[PDB]
Amino acid sequence: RPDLAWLDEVTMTQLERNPYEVYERLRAEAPLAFVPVLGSYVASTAEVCREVATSPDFEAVITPAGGRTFGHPAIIGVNGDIHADLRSMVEPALQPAEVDRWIDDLVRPIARRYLERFENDGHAELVAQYCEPVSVRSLGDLLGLQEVDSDKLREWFAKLNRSVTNAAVDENGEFANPEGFAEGDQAKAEIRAVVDPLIDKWIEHPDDSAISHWLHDGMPPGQTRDREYIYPTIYVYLLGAMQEPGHGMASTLVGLFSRPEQLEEVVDDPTLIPRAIAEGLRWTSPIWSATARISTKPVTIAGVDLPAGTPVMLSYGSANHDTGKYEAPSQYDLHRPPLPHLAFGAGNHACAGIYFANHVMRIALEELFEAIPNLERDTREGVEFWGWGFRGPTSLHVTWEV
Ligand code: HEM
Ligand SMILES: COc1ccccc1O
């Protein structure tokens, strides 16, 4: 596309460090555009992301680096009967009435445990000491991974993140950095060594862990789903499900710190925490551009005639700064009117874990603000955000008077 020749000079490093300047141009120039270093069409606006995500002429496809990492059948990358089965497999523990039965007793004692380690220190780096551990410890216990330390769960999602988002391609469309999948393969090998004995056990002795239910639910007597059939969805969980509530919490906190009067409002009135989190997810979407769809028929989207079989990456984090919807979207504003957003995606492949995720983030922030009501950001340290596929702050140094 001639007038987008500037896109040939966009680099993977640029998109990882800060994709918003390129995507502001895309939303104005070409809401559906082929980005050479990603080797794919990308959807950048709210209208195009929502249309592709809900279109009957599209179905799910995994991004190239996502498929190299997760294989088949990753719940995000399949359709039809396999997708319906995998959705029926994951949905029981995520049902709102079910989450409401036990989410408080799950997350609140975990939040308190991690807080007790630093709440009298006067300083902390909340990404590593709080947001990530609460997120992974909550989900890890729900899954049946109680014995996998939070440090290890955090390491695995970081390696899987880098492998799944190792998207750069060269002039021939080949991956530019094939070595960057090695740590994804190493994480998977480690996960197998830990999880294979647990699956061996659960097949014979089912329990209330979610993965035990994935093996047994809905199956004929004495049968379980084959572990190779469920492992790619285990990996989907050990990346995003483990990573994103912590990133959403942390981005919400960075946003609140950027508006001190609003941080104060929320600490004084914790019933505003859900609204603060919803704006946090719009402001820096944790899953920023990690999923995609593929056309099943020739289709015209945003004036582009796509043949059948065309992948489109859904850059929901850009869509959530669409100035057709939002005033000054790069500013965090608690008091934005509560409008639809796309941080959980849309359509038949929209996030299955919204209700659980929102509660994890809510409870963690409630406990944080109760424990440390005079929490302040350490303005001697900068907050750097990183990531194009998954995005969040790489640290969050704070201070408080002791
Ligand atoms: C703040 C935290 C989270 C955010 C922002 C988030 C966001 C997303 C997004 C954008 C997608 C892709 C939707 C699309 O392609 O249209 C997705 C997929 C998915 N998410 Fe969430 N997620 C979060 C936490 C979780 C958690 C904790 C779980 C599990 C307990 C979960 C389970 C899933 C599943 C199973 C899918 C795949 C749905 C499918 O392809 O059918 N997510 N999520
Ligand atoms: C819930 O986890 C994910 C969602 C979308 C893409 C990758 C994931 O691991």
Residue numbers in the entry: 6 to 407
What does the paper say about this structure?
GcoA belongs to the CYP255A family of cytochrome P450 enzymes. Our recent characterization of a two-component P450 enzyme system consisting of a reductase, GcoB, and a P450 oxidase, GcoA, demonstrated that it demethylates diverse aromatic compounds, including guaiacol (which can be derived from coniferyl alcohol and represents the aromatic functionality of G-lignin that must undergo demethylation), guaethol, anisole (methoxybenzene), 2-methylanisole, and 3-methoxycatechol (3MC) with similar or greater efficiency than other O-aryl-demethylases described in the literature. However, GcoAB shows poor reactivity toward syringol, which can be derived from sinapyl alcohol via high-temperature reactions and represents the aromatic functionality of S-lignin that must undergo O-demethylation for further catabolism via ring-opening dioxygenases. In the present study, we hypothesized that substitution of GcoA-F169, which has the closest interaction with the bound substrate, may relax the specificity of the enzyme sufficiently to permit the O-demethylation of S-lignin type substrates.
The closest contact is with GcoA-F169, which forms a hydrophobic interaction with the C6 carbon on the aromatic ring of guaiacol. A broader survey of variants at the GcoA-F169 position (amino acids S, H, V, I, and L in addition to A) confirmed that GcoA-F169A exhibits the best catalytic performance in terms of both specific activity and reaction coupling, although other small side chains (S and V) also permitted reactivity with syringol, suggesting that these may permit syringol to assume a reactive conformation at the heme. Each protein variant also crystallized successfully with guaiacol and the structures showed that the orientation of the bound ligand remained consistent with that of the WT enzyme. Furthermore, comparison of the surrounding active site architecture confirmed no significant deviation from the WT.
